[PDB]
């Protein structure tokens, strides 16, 4: 494989800190806040 050829020469890829589950949780929180409150959850409390 090409990935193993990169790995065998000291070239590694670090994983991201935030996984796609937590990114989707952030987008779900923003979407639910926007739907249920408008701009008020961005200005202050929902």
């Amino acid at each position: 494989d090409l990935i193993c050829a990169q790995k065998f020469n000291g070239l590694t890829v670090l994983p991201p800190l935030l996984t796609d589950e937590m990114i989707a949780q952030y987008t779900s929180a923003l979407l639910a806040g926007t739907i249920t409150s408008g701009w008020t959850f961005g200005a202050g409390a929902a």
Binding site: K7, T12, L14, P15
Partner: peptide, 30 residues
């Protein structure tokens, strides 16, 4: 992984991209 030496002298070791059964408490992360 360490806190400051002003706080403590205790460290943890992260072996990157290595399975925990292939190393020369133990936790396994991605």
């Amino acid at each position: 992984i360490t806190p400051g030496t002003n706080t403590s002298n205790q460290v943890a070791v992260l072996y990157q991209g290595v399975n925990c059964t292939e190393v020369p408490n133990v936790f396994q992360t991605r």
